[PDB]
Design a protein around this ligand. Structure first.
Ligand SMILES: [K+]
Length: 108
């Protein structure tokens, strides 16, 4: 089950570049974001996930496409921003950070 009720604040690393991202860069970024989150919110104070596939491998990203998402308690908003802001260093091109109560999903 997804802790949507307990971790209502969502942070999203939104791509602003079209490009291929290696499994190594994506994992690096997840490590980075995870590390800061555990020491800032507690190993169980959040949920993190890479929204790209295949996840060596290579994954494609489009402009405006979510790369990574974190959910936690409203009080940790600032830590999420810092987690995503650091992690975006493992990826070339430009990335943006979006905060909301929605996790988002692919739709047609
Ligand atoms: K970057």
């Amino acid at each position: 089950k997804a802790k949507v009720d307990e971790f209502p604040l969502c942070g999203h690393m939104v791509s602003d570049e079209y490009e291929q991202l290696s499994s190594e860069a994506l994992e690096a970024a997840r490590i980075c974001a995870n590390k800061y989150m555990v020491k800032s919110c507690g190993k169980d104070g959040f949920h993190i996930r890479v929204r790209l596939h295949p996840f060596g491998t290579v994954a494609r990203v489009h402009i405006g496409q979510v790369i990574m998402s974190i959910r936690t308690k409203l009080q940790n908003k600032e830590h999420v921003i810092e987690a995503l802001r650091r992690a975006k260093f493992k990826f070339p091109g430009r990335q943006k950070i979006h905060i909301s109560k929605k996790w988002g999903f692919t739709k047609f």
